[PDB]
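## Example record

The block below lists the input lines for one assembly entry, exactly as stored, with component labels intact.
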Amino acid sequence: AQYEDGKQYTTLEKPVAGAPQVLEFFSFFCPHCYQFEEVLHISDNVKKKLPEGVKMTKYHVNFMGGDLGKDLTQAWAVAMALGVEDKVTVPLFEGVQKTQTIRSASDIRDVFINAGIKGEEYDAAWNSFVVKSLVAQQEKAAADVQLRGVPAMFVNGKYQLNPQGMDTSNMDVFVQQYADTVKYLSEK
Amino acid sequence: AQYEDGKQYTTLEKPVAGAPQVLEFFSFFCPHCYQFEEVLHISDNVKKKLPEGVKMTKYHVNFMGGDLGKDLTQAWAVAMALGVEDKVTVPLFEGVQKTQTIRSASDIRDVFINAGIKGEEYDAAWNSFVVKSLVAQQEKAAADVQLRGVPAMFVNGKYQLNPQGMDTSNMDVFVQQYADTVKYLSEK
Ligand SMILES: Cc1nc(-c2ccc(C(F)(F)F)cc2)sc1C(=O)O
Ligand SMILES: Cc1nc(-c2ccc(C(F)(F)F)cc2)sc1C(=O)O
Ligand SMILES: [Cu+2]
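Predicted structure tokens for the full assembly:
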């Protein structure tokens, strides 16, 4: 059979209900995450091939980057709440990993202000119930799958993508194999 | 006191005779090691604060990454023998952890070739007894400090850095304390 358990994906021993259809975890400190999102365009592709009515969810994790990692999880909650994911993702990756100009919560705030968000509005969002709830949601989701590393992607809280088990030579084929695996799993 | 045994550092029960003054262990498979290099630049910041006449030594370890881990220790021995550590450290870290394009000994070699090390020069070093000795040297040093994990740093075969006991509330404050602790220990 084309798709084999342990090859393109693994099956969670204890799946959790109410899980997002397609859930991606990442960290702005995570170099392979940077590669997935900005070089291979994994999420772009996944989305291209997702069936109708299937949405992609992406959460940040706390466990990379020391305490700043936690601030980045809250900043990502702000990005989701304000709908600016597609404006701040590059300056956050670049600021953490490339130029190393993001070292403190204030440096994160500066990225949002530089992208056109008013400081007063960033601060209001930062302290909002929506963002507090989103932070807890991101942390619970990681706990629910006993998440130990990123990048990671889960389908319906039942299956975990296993890129290590895919074609690791031809990246164009790899990227579509990853996307096709998500599509196939979503149809299960 | 400001510096305390059990705080910023610990004391080896069995001090190592003839150890390097400042000895750092890492693996190209080690995610925290990637951060120590690329994001914190721990070695460089330790170096710029060390007294005159104190040299720094950095060894690779086998215990991460199985077969390729051992290949990387041998390649690091080649890097040391040829004096090209600064040319290959970033592309080896990125090849293993960011792009995941390093999967074999040949892929490791490609990094050196792309960095300008000639093919015959690399191969002659790889197969040399000088390099065999450097591999054994790295392994023996790890055994002698009873190494359990990386990153790790040891001063004068007597003291082990304990980043857990440092000010980790800011990554730059942390790097500063780490480097200042090494300086303190080197003067001790
Ligand atoms: C547990 C641990 N955690 C470390 C760490 C945390 C954060 C960062 C950075 F913020 F720079 F990304 C680097 C290393 S090193 C380390 C160890 O095993 O000594
Ligand atoms: C050994 C260690 N090392 C840690 C660490 C090092 C650096 C940083 C930062 F750079 F982010 F400030 C955070 C935590 S936590 C930790 C532990 O296991 O207790
Ligand atoms: Cu089959």
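The interface with chain B takes residues 29, 31-32, 34-35, 39, 64-68, 96-97, 100, 103-104, 168 of chain A (CB under 8 Å). The pocket of WF4 (ligand 2) is lined by residues A 66; B 40, 163-164, 168, 171, 174 (CB under 6 Å).
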